[model samples]
Structure formats: C-alpha cells, structure tokens
Target: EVETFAFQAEIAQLMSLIINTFYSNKEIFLRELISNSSDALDKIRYESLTDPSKLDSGKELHINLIPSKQDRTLTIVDTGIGMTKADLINNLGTIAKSGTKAFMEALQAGADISMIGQFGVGFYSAYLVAEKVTVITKHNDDEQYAWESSAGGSFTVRTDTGEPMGRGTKVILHLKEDQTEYLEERRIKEIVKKHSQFIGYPITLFVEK
Candidate 1:
C-alpha cells in the first residue's frame, strides 16, 4: 500500500533553507549521496563480520552512478544494507530519529564542509539538484519499498513491485531542469574526484558511448 506523509516541520524548513543557501555549491549534493552510499556499504560489511549470512547480497560491495540523459536523472545504486519501511519513515521523514537536529544547527552556524558526513543529514541534500528524489531499497528482511518526495509538504512510501535489486538501495534523482549538468559524465567525475576520492568502496560511473 502507498502511504503519503507530511515532512516533519523541521525537515520542511531545512529543505527550504538548504536549497536557498547551498545553490551556489549545488555540486556538493553528489558528495552527500556518495557518502551515504559508502556508509551503507560499510554497515553491511561490519555486520557481516559477526554474521556472515548478512552478506547474503553477495561479497561485492560497491557504488554505481548511472546518469541517464534521456530520463534527465542520475541514479545512485549501492550494494549495501538497505532499509525497511519503518526505516524509510524514521530515517527520511523525520529529523528526530537521526542527528538531523544537530546537523541543522551546524548548517545554520555555517559549519565547514569537513563536517558533512558526520551525520545522516546528507540524504536531504539530494534536493539541491533533484526536483524529485526516489529511494527504492530492498532489505534482506523486508519487502522492497520506495520513498519519494519533491521536497514538498509531503512524501510517499510505497511497496515497490519493480525489478528485484537483491539487497541494496537505489536512489533516483530526477534532476531539476537547470541542474542537468549533474547528468554528465565529465561533470560527475570531477565532483567525485574532488570529494569522494578517499571513499572505501569502488565507485563506478556508467558512461554511455
């Protein structure tokens, strides 16, 4: 069943502020998304240490960036610990569950970019270049579900019956009209080099010839 829920008040405010304040450096959005993907990969690897079965998704853990000019979307897929429906609501829908309150304070205080990945707030930064963000994730323990939002008053979480992703999170960013630069190979590579150069997982960008 598809459920629509309003963004937590603070998240709504944060989205607006983020879009306005970070427009000049919108490229950092890619950094945030990649960081989150890397974190997910790390989590599954750590968990698998105690329970090898947790790596049921396969031994390979990496992040893939697929830019589709036809669809005007940038898709980030990671072979990692995906989230459940409840996790979608709690992690994405509300700031209370994560260190988002602290994150917001840092942003408001003009904290350094060095502090970016210290918290889970990076997920929301997708709005910097994406008019709509769709997160389709499959957890080993739950059915596949998608959480979608346009940074509007509300967002939706629905059961996804699309292709099975095994176990990982696929984030599709429907790029804003003016943000089409993000859907380019050279542009993304530059950003990745500038920010995610030290990330642990293998980062692959699918380039069409």
Candidate 2:
C-alpha cells in the first residue's frame, strides 16, 4: 500500500521560512546527511551492546556517497539501523512529529548549527540544492520501502519491491541545475573537511578527493 501526506499549516510555514533563509547554506547539507548516517550507525552499535544478537552485530559500519554528474544524482548510502515503515512516516512526514516542533522551537529561540545537527532537522536541508529527494531504507523488522518528495508540502511512501537492501538507508538527491558543483569530487571533499571530518564513521567517497 502507498500513503501520501502533507505538512500541517503551521509547520509548513516554518519549514518554508527556514528553507528560504538558508538555502544558500548548501554545503552543510551533505555534512548534516553524513552526520545523520553516523547517528544511525551509532544507534545500532548501542543496540549490539545490550543485545549481542542485534541485527548489526559484528558488522563494520560505514557511510558512502557517490556523485553521478550524468544523471544529476548524488547518493548517500549507509550501513545503519534502518527505519521501519512507521518510522519512515514519523521522521519524514514533517509537521506530524516531534522533530519539526523541536527544530522550530530551537530555531525560534536562536538555535545554532550545532543545535540543528543535534536534532534531525538537517534532513530537510537537502532541499538547498536537490530538486527532488528519494530515500530507500530497510530494517530487519520490515520490508524495504521508498519515500519521495519535492518539499512542496506533501510526500509519498510505498513498499519497494526492488532487491532488498539487507539493512540500511540510501538517500538520492536530484541535483538542481545550478548546483552541479556539488557533484565535483574536490568540492565534496572540501565540504567534508570543513564540516564532517571529525564525524565518527568512515565516509567513503567514490570520487576523487
């Protein structure tokens, strides 16, 4: 089954304001995405500590990003604790969850970049340069599914029948025409060095740094 939803009236306003105010802060989007991947990996790592038979036990966790200029797509893939169908709706459904309220509350009171990072608000930052965003994720408890949106108020989620991902998430960003610089190897590495060099997980880039 497929589902479609929209942002609530108030959260829609805040999301629009933030997107317009900081869309030019494009470089930080990748940094934030990588950091999110790290957080997911860490969560599974923690689970392994208490439940040695956890899904990710004894696995090497990593994040990988690849840019495809020809297709105008950039993908961020991670070996992490993937979200289930319900988890997808909660996190990606915008105004329907705690993240938006939390982020808006912090932003309204002058929260800084670190505050944004500490919360999960960073995912929406992908709209800074992506025309459309698609996410594919799989969790041990649920079948793989894909979610997609243009950040224009609504999003759709559906069961993905493609090959199973085993367990992880992949974010595919369709690059905006003028933002092709993000596909450049040197540019991505420079951005990584500036923002995510100290991140906990290994970030593997398929392109030259």
Winner by lDDT: 1
Query: Which segments of candidate 1 are over 4 A away from where they belong?
Result: 91-98, 106-119
Tens-digit lDDT string for candidate 1 (46-148): 9999999988767889999999999999999998899988888865555443566777788668875435457667777788888899999988889899989
- RMSD per model, one decimal: 2.1, 3.0
Which segments of model 2 are wrong by more than 4 Å?
56-58, 91-115
Worst 10 residues of 1 by lDDT: 91-100
Please count the clashing residue pairs in each candidate, in the order shown.
0, 0
Q: In angstroms, how far off is 143's CA in candidate 1?
A: 0.9
lDDT (Cα, 0-100) at 50 in candidate 1 = 97
Clashing pairs in 2: none
TM-score for each prediction? 0.91, 0.85
lDDT of 2 by residue, 16-96 (tens): 765567545678889889988998999888887888666642377899989999889899999798888887776445434
Prediction 2 TM-score vs. true: 0.85
Q: TM-score of predicted model 1?
A: 0.91
